[PDB]
Amino acid sequence: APHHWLLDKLSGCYAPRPSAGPHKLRESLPLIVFLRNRLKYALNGREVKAILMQRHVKVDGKVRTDTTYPAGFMDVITLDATNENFRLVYDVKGRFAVHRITDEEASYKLGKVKKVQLGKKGVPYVVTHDGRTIRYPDPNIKVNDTVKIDLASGKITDFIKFDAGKLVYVTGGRNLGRIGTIVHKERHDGGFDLVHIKDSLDNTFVTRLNNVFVIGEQGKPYISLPKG
Amino acid sequence: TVQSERAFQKQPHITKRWYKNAGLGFKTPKTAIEGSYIDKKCPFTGLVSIRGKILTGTVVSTKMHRTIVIRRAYLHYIPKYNRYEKRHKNVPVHVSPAFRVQVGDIVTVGQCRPISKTVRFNVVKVS
Amino acid sequence: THFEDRFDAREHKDRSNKSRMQAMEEYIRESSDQPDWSASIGADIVNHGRGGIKSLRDTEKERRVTSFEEDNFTRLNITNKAEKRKQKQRERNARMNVIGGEDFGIFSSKRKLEDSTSRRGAKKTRSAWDRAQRRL
Amino acid sequence: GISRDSRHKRSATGAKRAQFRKKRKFELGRQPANTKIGAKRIHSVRTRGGNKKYRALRIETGNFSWASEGISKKTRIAGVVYHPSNNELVRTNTLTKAAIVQIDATPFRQWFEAHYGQTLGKAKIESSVESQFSAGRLYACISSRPGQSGRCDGYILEGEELAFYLRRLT
RNA sequence: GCUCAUUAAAUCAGUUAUCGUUUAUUUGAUAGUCAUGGUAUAACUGUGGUAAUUCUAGAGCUAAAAUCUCGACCCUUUGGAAGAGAUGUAUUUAUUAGAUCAAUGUCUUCGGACUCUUUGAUGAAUAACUUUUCGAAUCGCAUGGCCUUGUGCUGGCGAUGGUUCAUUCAAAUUUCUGCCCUAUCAACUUUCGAUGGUAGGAUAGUGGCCUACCAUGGUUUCAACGGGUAACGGGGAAUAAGGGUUCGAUUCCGGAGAGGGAGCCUGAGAAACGG
């Protein structure tokens, strides 16, 4: 069992494996861990099945009926009961954190582009980290930038180019998952670019450029970070 | 002589000379554009993509054909003794006919979708 | 050079139980001056007798189960390869060491008290100017 | 059949001969079909489950492109002229990539007359090719893999590349 | 799934690289180019053979389209349009595409001129081929619209396919750094290619992987290469023991095999012993 699920070692031998999906499997949190295990909505594994078939839960504007469905970082998980909307966000200590958001904030998500090329018949396209490929983006949108997604359609309402001095979340590596808003961008052999980070206590931290997820300007983040 | 092999040498063209930039601040030399060598394995004007390790070292042996040997000296740190050890790593690399190489020749290469059985790096800069 | 850039669960893992030495905290409970939530009398003892009364570790770890059972509404059970040690070797740790519900197994230990504290352990005043600021 | 396991041959420093494992399926190799000129037979191979490859073994017609006018006309195939890797292939008339052949000049001839209004050296092109139009046999080269696509596709010789190969043929 | 035989830059551990590759499933994008064709399996009906079989024999049945730009014009308001033309999918090879402007800069004769510097802002399909692939003889809700009123003509929202791309589950190689003893192993390799070049082949693909032809190189006192390893020893691989002093369990070994050899076939995956 991985670290970031907050499961106990107790209650049963085998760990619930993730399904293949949009997110990476080691980055994923399955919905069985999301409902009965951390949010404590269900008790048995079969009780997760009754919730999914009745279509209570919707993840990122889709029905999303699967027990081991992979949910990852920055995923709007809308539950039709209680009129409450949930957004997954990683916690500094090594784990995931379920977070309350608003209806307007459940409309948009942010997404890191991983690769951009020129599609067929002369069409630009960007590929997000959640695998949402979008036709005709802004040519300003280039590699490692975030993308604000409409989720009513697949359209792009805001875009933030990668420039030094903007509030960055880390997705990967040792120092994974903090604020720290940038020091600069380092070059190294093999790429291995180390986009440096100085936190609220102004301490240098080093992860890869692959792990960099721009969650806002210096000052404003675009989403409601959980305060605690 | 250009056409000295048994087959006619040409670029695939994927001036009568087609160029491209290998990137990362490695400039296209005069020998690349206005030259005579074909060299499909060359970073510029060829069919390789420099991605992966961009490393540096010292060329120590040049007596091969179209390829050279980089010696990569460094210092190891042993934590038990709290001493140092002098080391080196003789790495053979493909050289392109744009760079004037003999013994010496501080060099820079790039990882190039391994060419031949030990060659993973092709010469992109010689100083 | 080369760098690992690998995430570690073990560095984020809590190590509180590794250096936690029981006689040190018994000084704490007297010098804490907070109350300490003692249970009732007959609520302690195990099986009308035979099992010695309760360890204060035992009313902790059993409390951890009841705090876990009221959250998940379910129970945990007779699972055998863990039970064959942790019920045999634990209830014999009672009869070897606990006397009247209070543990005397501390005092035969070779685990020494110094290795927890160790002149504050790390962040030690190794230089002269470090020693002046602890006087501050 | 053919195995591509890199262990058995020696190291850079001379360490050798482990036989850590036996030959397995993903390190596979199959066999060349030395294709000839005859009535076209199409071969079938199933490769990695979903994909397929086209072995070629006898080839009658193929598509060749005339490089000066940029037009493409399907070509009847007669004989093999030159190949650099091994001249055993030419004397057995075997087609591979970069193989010099002889073709029929009449399909490129029929395009030249009724579209333009001229004959073929009895609208100006090279001198070394125009003398070959009266011969009825033009020289062409292969730019496809018959071992993979199965087709005999290629290019006719023009320019200085013409002068390179005709120097070899004398 | 079980059982037999011990590997030292190998495994493994992390790390890349996949613009070097293949991928069933997962997810996200994406296609304007006859109220019903023609076949076909049997079961069955009955006759038999065969020591025997999940063995067998013979017989009779069931052109039109629409969109893109051009717009003569007419008309001022929601603006609307005649006709001028232009466009297959996959697969295969060859060919083709993939200097400037605005002023706020500056000059001026106050009319404008100038892009030297700045500020912004633009750029960087043809011709053929194919044992012609697809272009839906697919399903559910809504039942509406026009007239020559026939059960005609037309028309909404989906779902499932299906091409290609991306995604993930993989797998394949790969980058790099990190293993125990040893000079009573100093040369090792080219003595199954060793080092590389180029060309072909093979493969999912890189590639001396294989083979032609061409050069004589590789690693090394910084220890190559060779030897010993009882490599039941080791891996924080992983929690663990809230004082048993450093305890536990779990996972990982590495390889081969299914009477022995050898060759093959399906499948995303096996060189599969329940062929």
PDB file of N, CA and C (backbone and C1' of nucleotides) in Angstrom, chain D residues 1 4 8-10 13 17 24 30 46-49 51 53 55 63 72 74 85 97 143 145 148 151 153, chain E residues 22 92-93 127-130 173 189-190 192 194 199-205 207 209 212 225 267 269 271:
ATOM      1  N   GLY D   1      13.277 -18.237 -33.870  1.00  0.00           N
ATOM      2  CA  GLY D   1      14.302 -18.437 -34.878  1.00  0.00           C
ATOM      3  C   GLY D   1      15.553 -17.621 -34.627  1.00  0.00           C
ATOM      4  N   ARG D   4      18.087 -11.942 -30.786  1.00  0.00           N
ATOM      5  CA  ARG D   4      18.847 -10.694 -30.737  1.00  0.00           C
ATOM      6  C   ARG D   4      19.325 -10.393 -29.317  1.00  0.00           C
ATOM      7  N   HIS D   8      25.344 -12.839 -25.099  1.00  0.00           N
ATOM      8  CA  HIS D   8      26.317 -13.880 -25.433  1.00  0.00           C
ATOM      9  C   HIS D   8      27.609 -13.308 -25.995  1.00  0.00           C
ATOM     10  N   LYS D   9      27.503 -12.312 -26.868  1.00  0.00           N
ATOM     11  CA  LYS D   9      28.685 -11.639 -27.374  1.00  0.00           C
ATOM     12  C   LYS D   9      29.395 -10.890 -26.249  1.00  0.00           C
ATOM     13  N   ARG D  10      30.665 -10.582 -26.489  1.00  0.00           N
ATOM     14  CA  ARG D  10      31.533 -10.113 -25.421  1.00  0.00           C
ATOM     15  C   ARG D  10      31.210  -8.678 -25.028  1.00  0.00           C
ATOM     16  N   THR D  13      34.967  -4.623 -22.430  1.00  0.00           N
ATOM     17  CA  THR D  13      36.224  -4.976 -21.792  1.00  0.00           C
ATOM     18  C   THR D  13      36.585  -6.448 -21.940  1.00  0.00           C
ATOM     19  N   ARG D  17      29.946 -14.545 -22.172  1.00  0.00           N
ATOM     20  CA  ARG D  17      29.447 -15.923 -22.136  1.00  0.00           C
ATOM     21  C   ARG D  17      28.779 -16.277 -20.805  1.00  0.00           C
ATOM     22  N   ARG D  24      13.760 -16.172 -25.891  1.00  0.00           N
ATOM     23  CA  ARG D  24      12.355 -15.937 -25.610  1.00  0.00           C
ATOM     24  C   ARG D  24      11.702 -15.276 -26.815  1.00  0.00           C
ATOM     25  N   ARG D  30      12.814 -13.103 -37.774  1.00  0.00           N
ATOM     26  CA  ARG D  30      12.253 -13.944 -38.819  1.00  0.00           C
ATOM     27  C   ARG D  30      13.091 -13.816 -40.084  1.00  0.00           C
ATOM     28  N   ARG D  46       1.843 -12.263 -39.261  1.00  0.00           N
ATOM     29  CA  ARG D  46       1.186 -11.595 -38.139  1.00  0.00           C
ATOM     30  C   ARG D  46       2.273 -11.162 -37.159  1.00  0.00           C
ATOM     31  N   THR D  47       2.331  -9.863 -36.858  1.00  0.00           N
ATOM     32  CA  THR D  47       3.426  -9.282 -36.084  1.00  0.00           C
ATOM     33  C   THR D  47       2.887  -8.562 -34.857  1.00  0.00           C
ATOM     34  N   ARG D  48       3.304  -9.030 -33.673  1.00  0.00           N
ATOM     35  CA  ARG D  48       2.916  -8.470 -32.369  1.00  0.00           C
ATOM     36  C   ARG D  48       1.403  -8.365 -32.208  1.00  0.00           C
ATOM     37  N   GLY D  49       0.705  -9.439 -32.553  1.00  0.00           N
ATOM     38  CA  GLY D  49      -0.720  -9.504 -32.319  1.00  0.00           C
ATOM     39  C   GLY D  49      -1.548  -8.727 -33.319  1.00  0.00           C
ATOM     40  N   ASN D  51      -0.562  -6.146 -35.556  1.00  0.00           N
ATOM     41  CA  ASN D  51       0.016  -5.618 -36.781  1.00  0.00           C
ATOM     42  C   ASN D  51       0.452  -6.739 -37.716  1.00  0.00           C
ATOM     43  N   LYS D  53       3.057  -7.554 -41.423  1.00  0.00           N
ATOM     44  CA  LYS D  53       4.108  -7.150 -42.343  1.00  0.00           C
ATOM     45  C   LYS D  53       3.933  -7.891 -43.657  1.00  0.00           C
ATOM     46  N   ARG D  55       6.012  -9.597 -46.376  1.00  0.00           N
ATOM     47  CA  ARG D  55       7.120 -10.212 -47.091  1.00  0.00           C
ATOM     48  C   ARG D  55       6.830 -10.177 -48.587  1.00  0.00           C
ATOM     49  N   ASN D  63       5.428   0.742 -58.374  1.00  0.00           N
ATOM     50  CA  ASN D  63       5.187   2.149 -58.660  1.00  0.00           C
ATOM     51  C   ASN D  63       6.500   2.916 -58.561  1.00  0.00           C
ATOM     52  N   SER D  72       4.170  10.187 -61.372  1.00  0.00           N
ATOM     53  CA  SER D  72       4.335   8.810 -60.931  1.00  0.00           C
ATOM     54  C   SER D  72       3.526   7.890 -61.833  1.00  0.00           C
ATOM     55  N   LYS D  74       3.023   3.573 -62.908  1.00  0.00           N
ATOM     56  CA  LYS D  74       3.281   2.226 -62.404  1.00  0.00           C
ATOM     57  C   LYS D  74       4.126   1.469 -63.422  1.00  0.00           C
ATOM     58  N   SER D  85      25.425  -3.687 -51.364  1.00  0.00           N
ATOM     59  CA  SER D  85      25.705  -4.498 -50.182  1.00  0.00           C
ATOM     60  C   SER D  85      26.280  -5.859 -50.555  1.00  0.00           C
ATOM     61  N   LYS D  97      16.203  -2.547 -50.821  1.00  0.00           N
ATOM     62  CA  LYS D  97      16.300  -1.095 -50.882  1.00  0.00           C
ATOM     63  C   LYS D  97      17.642  -0.699 -51.486  1.00  0.00           C
ATOM     64  N   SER D 143      13.525   2.654 -53.393  1.00  0.00           N
ATOM     65  CA  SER D 143      13.521   3.419 -52.155  1.00  0.00           C
ATOM     66  C   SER D 143      12.490   2.901 -51.162  1.00  0.00           C
ATOM     67  N   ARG D 145      11.173  -0.842 -48.823  1.00  0.00           N
ATOM     68  CA  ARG D 145      11.601  -2.123 -48.263  1.00  0.00           C
ATOM     69  C   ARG D 145      10.607  -3.186 -48.704  1.00  0.00           C
ATOM     70  N   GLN D 148       9.352  -5.416 -45.936  1.00  0.00           N
ATOM     71  CA  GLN D 148       8.397  -4.874 -44.979  1.00  0.00           C
ATOM     72  C   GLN D 148       7.085  -4.459 -45.625  1.00  0.00           C
ATOM     73  N   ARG D 151       6.040  -3.889 -51.448  1.00  0.00           N
ATOM     74  CA  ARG D 151       5.932  -3.195 -52.719  1.00  0.00           C
ATOM     75  C   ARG D 151       7.312  -3.017 -53.331  1.00  0.00           C
ATOM     76  N   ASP D 153       8.602  -0.118 -54.781  1.00  0.00           N
ATOM     77  CA  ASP D 153       8.484   1.312 -54.987  1.00  0.00           C
ATOM     78  C   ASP D 153       9.870   1.936 -54.936  1.00  0.00           C
TER      79      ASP D 153
ATOM     80  P     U E  22       5.138   1.483 -32.696  1.00  0.00           P
ATOM     81  O5'   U E  22       4.123   0.380 -32.165  1.00  0.00           O
ATOM     82  C5'   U E  22       4.097  -0.920 -32.729  1.00  0.00           C
ATOM     83  C4'   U E  22       3.701  -1.947 -31.703  1.00  0.00           C
ATOM     84  C3'   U E  22       2.377  -1.698 -30.997  1.00  0.00           C
ATOM     85  O3'   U E  22       1.258  -2.131 -31.745  1.00  0.00           O
ATOM     86  C1'   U E  22       4.038  -2.239 -29.403  1.00  0.00           C
ATOM     87  P     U E  92       1.994   2.511 -45.095  1.00  0.00           P
ATOM     88  O5'   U E  92       2.662   2.509 -46.539  1.00  0.00           O
ATOM     89  C5'   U E  92       3.035   1.288 -47.158  1.00  0.00           C
ATOM     90  C4'   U E  92       3.445   1.490 -48.593  1.00  0.00           C
ATOM     91  C3'   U E  92       4.404   2.636 -48.859  1.00  0.00           C
ATOM     92  O3'   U E  92       5.747   2.299 -48.567  1.00  0.00           O
ATOM     93  C1'   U E  92       2.666   2.647 -50.474  1.00  0.00           C
ATOM     94  P     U E  93       6.689   3.352 -47.808  1.00  0.00           P
ATOM     95  O5'   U E  93       7.271   4.268 -48.974  1.00  0.00           O
ATOM     96  C5'   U E  93       8.427   3.872 -49.696  1.00  0.00           C
ATOM     97  C4'   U E  93       8.431   4.411 -51.106  1.00  0.00           C
ATOM     98  C3'   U E  93       8.813   5.870 -51.280  1.00  0.00           C
ATOM     99  O3'   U E  93      10.208   6.096 -51.203  1.00  0.00           O
ATOM    100  C1'   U E  93       6.935   5.370 -52.627  1.00  0.00           C
ATOM    101  P     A E 127      -2.827  15.925 -59.486  1.00  0.00           P
ATOM    102  O5'   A E 127      -1.959  14.693 -60.000  1.00  0.00           O
ATOM    103  C5'   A E 127      -0.961  14.878 -60.992  1.00  0.00           C
ATOM    104  C4'   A E 127       0.082  13.791 -60.946  1.00  0.00           C
ATOM    105  C3'   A E 127      -0.441  12.376 -60.802  1.00  0.00           C
ATOM    106  O3'   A E 127      -0.923  11.844 -62.019  1.00  0.00           O
ATOM    107  C1'   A E 127       1.359  12.697 -59.316  1.00  0.00           C
ATOM    108  P     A E 128      -2.143  10.808 -61.998  1.00  0.00           P
ATOM    109  O5'   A E 128      -1.448   9.399 -62.238  1.00  0.00           O
ATOM    110  C5'   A E 128      -1.909   8.244 -61.558  1.00  0.00           C
ATOM    111  C4'   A E 128      -0.764   7.444 -60.995  1.00  0.00           C
ATOM    112  C3'   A E 128      -1.146   6.202 -60.212  1.00  0.00           C
ATOM    113  O3'   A E 128      -1.468   5.100 -61.041  1.00  0.00           O
ATOM    114  C1'   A E 128       0.455   7.420 -58.993  1.00  0.00           C
ATOM    115  P     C E 129      -2.738   4.182 -60.694  1.00  0.00           P
ATOM    116  O5'   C E 129      -2.191   3.189 -59.580  1.00  0.00           O
ATOM    117  C5'   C E 129      -0.994   2.464 -59.801  1.00  0.00           C
ATOM    118  C4'   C E 129      -0.382   1.989 -58.510  1.00  0.00           C
ATOM    119  C3'   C E 129      -1.237   1.060 -57.672  1.00  0.00           C
ATOM    120  O3'   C E 129      -1.213  -0.269 -58.157  1.00  0.00           O
ATOM    121  C1'   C E 129      -0.198   2.686 -56.287  1.00  0.00           C
ATOM    122  P     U E 130      -2.546  -1.162 -58.138  1.00  0.00           P
ATOM    123  O5'   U E 130      -2.581  -1.751 -56.659  1.00  0.00           O
ATOM    124  C5'   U E 130      -1.446  -2.413 -56.109  1.00  0.00           C
ATOM    125  C4'   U E 130      -1.523  -2.520 -54.604  1.00  0.00           C
ATOM    126  C3'   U E 130      -2.593  -3.470 -54.067  1.00  0.00           C
ATOM    127  O3'   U E 130      -2.115  -4.104 -52.883  1.00  0.00           O
ATOM    128  C1'   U E 130      -2.965  -1.309 -53.207  1.00  0.00           C
ATOM    129  P     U E 173      14.575  -6.210 -22.916  1.00  0.00           P
ATOM    130  O5'   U E 173      15.893  -5.991 -23.776  1.00  0.00           O
ATOM    131  C5'   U E 173      16.791  -4.942 -23.464  1.00  0.00           C
ATOM    132  C4'   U E 173      16.682  -3.801 -24.443  1.00  0.00           C
ATOM    133  C3'   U E 173      17.424  -2.544 -24.041  1.00  0.00           C
ATOM    134  O3'   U E 173      18.806  -2.600 -24.331  1.00  0.00           O
ATOM    135  C1'   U E 173      15.243  -1.966 -24.722  1.00  0.00           C
ATOM    136  P     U E 189      41.325 -12.303 -23.459  1.00  0.00           P
ATOM    137  O5'   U E 189      40.578 -11.486 -24.605  1.00  0.00           O
ATOM    138  C5'   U E 189      39.166 -11.360 -24.593  1.00  0.00           C
ATOM    139  C4'   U E 189      38.697 -10.229 -25.472  1.00  0.00           C
ATOM    140  C3'   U E 189      38.946 -10.379 -26.966  1.00  0.00           C
ATOM    141  O3'   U E 189      37.989 -11.202 -27.613  1.00  0.00           O
ATOM    142  C1'   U E 189      39.575  -8.209 -26.263  1.00  0.00           C
ATOM    143  P     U E 190      38.279 -11.782 -29.083  1.00  0.00           P
ATOM    144  O5'   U E 190      37.827 -10.614 -30.062  1.00  0.00           O
ATOM    145  C5'   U E 190      37.434 -10.901 -31.391  1.00  0.00           C
ATOM    146  C4'   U E 190      38.206 -10.069 -32.381  1.00  0.00           C
ATOM    147  C3'   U E 190      39.219 -10.805 -33.236  1.00  0.00           C
ATOM    148  O3'   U E 190      38.613 -11.461 -34.335  1.00  0.00           O
ATOM    149  C1'   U E 190      40.165  -8.788 -32.406  1.00  0.00           C
ATOM    150  P     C E 192      36.366 -18.148 -30.707  1.00  0.00           P
ATOM    151  O5'   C E 192      34.901 -17.953 -31.301  1.00  0.00           O
ATOM    152  C5'   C E 192      34.157 -16.771 -31.026  1.00  0.00           C
ATOM    153  C4'   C E 192      33.175 -16.456 -32.126  1.00  0.00           C
ATOM    154  C3'   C E 192      32.447 -15.121 -31.984  1.00  0.00           C
ATOM    155  O3'   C E 192      32.160 -14.612 -33.285  1.00  0.00           O
ATOM    156  C1'   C E 192      30.873 -16.863 -32.002  1.00  0.00           C
ATOM    157  P     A E 194      32.313 -10.890 -29.700  1.00  0.00           P
ATOM    158  O5'   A E 194      33.490  -9.855 -29.426  1.00  0.00           O
ATOM    159  C5'   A E 194      33.257  -8.463 -29.579  1.00  0.00           C
ATOM    160  C4'   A E 194      34.465  -7.629 -29.233  1.00  0.00           C
ATOM    161  C3'   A E 194      34.363  -6.166 -29.625  1.00  0.00           C
ATOM    162  O3'   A E 194      33.622  -5.406 -28.691  1.00  0.00           O
ATOM    163  C1'   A E 194      36.466  -7.014 -30.293  1.00  0.00           C
ATOM    164  P     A E 199      23.928   4.357 -44.782  1.00  0.00           P
ATOM    165  O5'   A E 199      23.401   3.253 -45.795  1.00  0.00           O
ATOM    166  C5'   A E 199      23.950   3.160 -47.097  1.00  0.00           C
ATOM    167  C4'   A E 199      23.891   1.749 -47.612  1.00  0.00           C
ATOM    168  C3'   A E 199      22.741   0.904 -47.106  1.00  0.00           C
ATOM    169  O3'   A E 199      21.506   1.201 -47.729  1.00  0.00           O
ATOM    170  C1'   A E 199      24.728  -0.364 -47.061  1.00  0.00           C
ATOM    171  P     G E 200      20.134   1.027 -46.911  1.00  0.00           P
ATOM    172  O5'   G E 200      19.869  -0.544 -46.941  1.00  0.00           O
ATOM    173  C5'   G E 200      19.635  -1.202 -48.177  1.00  0.00           C
ATOM    174  C4'   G E 200      19.890  -2.686 -48.095  1.00  0.00           C
ATOM    175  C3'   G E 200      18.903  -3.490 -47.272  1.00  0.00           C
ATOM    176  O3'   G E 200      17.704  -3.774 -47.966  1.00  0.00           O
ATOM    177  C1'   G E 200      21.091  -4.131 -46.697  1.00  0.00           C
ATOM    178  P     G E 201      16.308  -3.707 -47.181  1.00  0.00           P
ATOM    179  O5'   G E 201      16.365  -4.962 -46.195  1.00  0.00           O
ATOM    180  C5'   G E 201      16.383  -6.282 -46.719  1.00  0.00           C
ATOM    181  C4'   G E 201      16.901  -7.306 -45.735  1.00  0.00           C
ATOM    182  C3'   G E 201      15.980  -7.675 -44.591  1.00  0.00           C
ATOM    183  O3'   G E 201      14.954  -8.563 -44.990  1.00  0.00           O
ATOM    184  C1'   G E 201      18.194  -7.424 -43.790  1.00  0.00           C
ATOM    185  P     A E 202      13.447  -8.320 -44.500  1.00  0.00           P
ATOM    186  O5'   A E 202      13.486  -8.723 -42.963  1.00  0.00           O
ATOM    187  C5'   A E 202      13.794 -10.055 -42.591  1.00  0.00           C
ATOM    188  C4'   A E 202      14.184 -10.154 -41.141  1.00  0.00           C
ATOM    189  C3'   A E 202      13.218  -9.546 -40.143  1.00  0.00           C
ATOM    190  O3'   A E 202      12.084 -10.351 -39.883  1.00  0.00           O
ATOM    191  C1'   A E 202      15.397  -8.856 -39.617  1.00  0.00           C
ATOM    192  P     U E 203      10.622  -9.687 -39.911  1.00  0.00           P
ATOM    193  O5'   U E 203      10.454  -9.072 -38.453  1.00  0.00           O
ATOM    194  C5'   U E 203      10.772  -9.834 -37.301  1.00  0.00           C
ATOM    195  C4'   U E 203      11.133  -8.946 -36.140  1.00  0.00           C
ATOM    196  C3'   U E 203      10.094  -7.914 -35.748  1.00  0.00           C
ATOM    197  O3'   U E 203       9.060  -8.457 -34.953  1.00  0.00           O
ATOM    198  C1'   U E 203      12.228  -6.899 -35.836  1.00  0.00           C
ATOM    199  P     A E 204       7.537  -8.051 -35.249  1.00  0.00           P
ATOM    200  O5'   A E 204       7.488  -6.508 -34.875  1.00  0.00           O
ATOM    201  C5'   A E 204       6.382  -5.705 -35.246  1.00  0.00           C
ATOM    202  C4'   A E 204       6.490  -4.339 -34.629  1.00  0.00           C
ATOM    203  C3'   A E 204       7.835  -3.657 -34.805  1.00  0.00           C
ATOM    204  O3'   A E 204       7.972  -3.015 -36.058  1.00  0.00           O
ATOM    205  C1'   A E 204       7.164  -3.515 -32.543  1.00  0.00           C
ATOM    206  P     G E 205       9.275  -3.288 -36.951  1.00  0.00           P
ATOM    207  O5'   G E 205      10.408  -2.420 -36.249  1.00  0.00           O
ATOM    208  C5'   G E 205      10.462  -1.021 -36.469  1.00  0.00           C
ATOM    209  C4'   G E 205      11.056  -0.279 -35.300  1.00  0.00           C
ATOM    210  C3'   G E 205      12.543  -0.453 -35.065  1.00  0.00           C
ATOM    211  O3'   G E 205      13.351   0.277 -35.970  1.00  0.00           O
ATOM    212  C1'   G E 205      11.404  -0.590 -33.008  1.00  0.00           C
ATOM    213  P     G E 207      19.052   1.949 -36.123  1.00  0.00           P
ATOM    214  O5'   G E 207      20.208   0.908 -35.816  1.00  0.00           O
ATOM    215  C5'   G E 207      21.361   1.345 -35.130  1.00  0.00           C
ATOM    216  C4'   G E 207      21.814   0.359 -34.090  1.00  0.00           C
ATOM    217  C3'   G E 207      22.566  -0.852 -34.583  1.00  0.00           C
ATOM    218  O3'   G E 207      23.890  -0.540 -34.963  1.00  0.00           O
ATOM    219  C1'   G E 207      21.074  -1.472 -32.865  1.00  0.00           C
ATOM    220  P     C E 209      25.115  -4.850 -31.402  1.00  0.00           P
ATOM    221  O5'   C E 209      23.927  -5.901 -31.527  1.00  0.00           O
ATOM    222  C5'   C E 209      24.208  -7.289 -31.598  1.00  0.00           C
ATOM    223  C4'   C E 209      23.054  -8.073 -32.165  1.00  0.00           C
ATOM    224  C3'   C E 209      23.315  -8.751 -33.497  1.00  0.00           C
ATOM    225  O3'   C E 209      24.018  -9.969 -33.352  1.00  0.00           O
ATOM    226  C1'   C E 209      21.208  -7.670 -33.543  1.00  0.00           C
ATOM    227  P     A E 212      30.084 -11.495 -43.916  1.00  0.00           P
ATOM    228  O5'   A E 212      29.819 -11.416 -45.481  1.00  0.00           O
ATOM    229  C5'   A E 212      30.693 -10.687 -46.318  1.00  0.00           C
ATOM    230  C4'   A E 212      29.951  -9.691 -47.165  1.00  0.00           C
ATOM    231  C3'   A E 212      30.742  -8.458 -47.562  1.00  0.00           C
ATOM    232  O3'   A E 212      31.601  -8.691 -48.663  1.00  0.00           O
ATOM    233  C1'   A E 212      28.616  -7.804 -46.773  1.00  0.00           C
ATOM    234  P     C E 225      36.142  -5.874 -16.605  1.00  0.00           P
ATOM    235  O5'   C E 225      36.904  -7.234 -16.933  1.00  0.00           O
ATOM    236  C5'   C E 225      37.222  -7.609 -18.266  1.00  0.00           C
ATOM    237  C4'   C E 225      38.384  -8.571 -18.297  1.00  0.00           C
ATOM    238  C3'   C E 225      38.234  -9.816 -17.436  1.00  0.00           C
ATOM    239  O3'   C E 225      37.452 -10.837 -18.025  1.00  0.00           O
ATOM    240  C1'   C E 225      40.346  -8.852 -17.036  1.00  0.00           C
ATOM    241  P     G E 267      -4.798 -14.729 -33.582  1.00  0.00           P
ATOM    242  O5'   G E 267      -4.599 -14.283 -32.067  1.00  0.00           O
ATOM    243  C5'   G E 267      -5.663 -14.327 -31.126  1.00  0.00           C
ATOM    244  C4'   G E 267      -5.151 -14.080 -29.729  1.00  0.00           C
ATOM    245  C3'   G E 267      -4.321 -12.818 -29.544  1.00  0.00           C
ATOM    246  O3'   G E 267      -5.107 -11.661 -29.336  1.00  0.00           O
ATOM    247  C1'   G E 267      -3.152 -14.644 -28.637  1.00  0.00           C
ATOM    248  P     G E 269       0.646 -10.315 -28.968  1.00  0.00           P
ATOM    249  O5'   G E 269       1.098 -10.631 -27.481  1.00  0.00           O
ATOM    250  C5'   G E 269       2.204  -9.956 -26.907  1.00  0.00           C
ATOM    251  C4'   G E 269       2.245 -10.167 -25.420  1.00  0.00           C
ATOM    252  C3'   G E 269       2.738 -11.527 -24.972  1.00  0.00           C
ATOM    253  O3'   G E 269       4.146 -11.646 -24.981  1.00  0.00           O
ATOM    254  C1'   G E 269       0.756 -11.008 -23.820  1.00  0.00           C
ATOM    255  P     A E 271       7.922 -17.138 -22.731  1.00  0.00           P
ATOM    256  O5'   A E 271       8.874 -17.060 -24.006  1.00  0.00           O
ATOM    257  C5'   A E 271       9.428 -18.241 -24.578  1.00  0.00           C
ATOM    258  C4'   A E 271       8.472 -18.877 -25.556  1.00  0.00           C
ATOM    259  C3'   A E 271       8.734 -20.341 -25.889  1.00  0.00           C
ATOM    260  O3'   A E 271       7.485 -21.009 -26.047  1.00  0.00           O
ATOM    261  C1'   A E 271       8.766 -19.056 -27.872  1.00  0.00           C
TER     262        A E 271
END
